[PDB]
What we know:
It is classed as virus. The entry lists the keywords bacteriophage, portal, virus. Chain A has 49 residues and is mostly loops. Chain A has one helix and no strands. Chain A has one helix at residues 30-35. The first copy, chain A, is rod-shaped, with a radius of gyration of 30 Å.
Amino acid sequence: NPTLFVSYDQNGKKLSFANWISVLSPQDTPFVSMTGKESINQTIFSWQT
Amino acid sequence: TQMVLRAPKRTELAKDGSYEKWMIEMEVGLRHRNPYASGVLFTAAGK
């Protein structure tokens, strides 16, 4: 027999989920950013010195 | 007539305790004019 109208009258009792994600994982790639790219045509190449 | 004596009212609450409980009181009565004016009809099974 609820009688005391306490300061809680939420009919929409849904939760309070957040609206973001704290994905703090490094992604920097300086070595590859500096090296450079070049296309090839086979899986086994060679270079002379 | 829906005779009314005391309208819903509250006492002195909020003594900084276990309060925040409310209530709805009502003092009401019934009255009929000329009893031999209206009528009641019961249900009958036998005699």
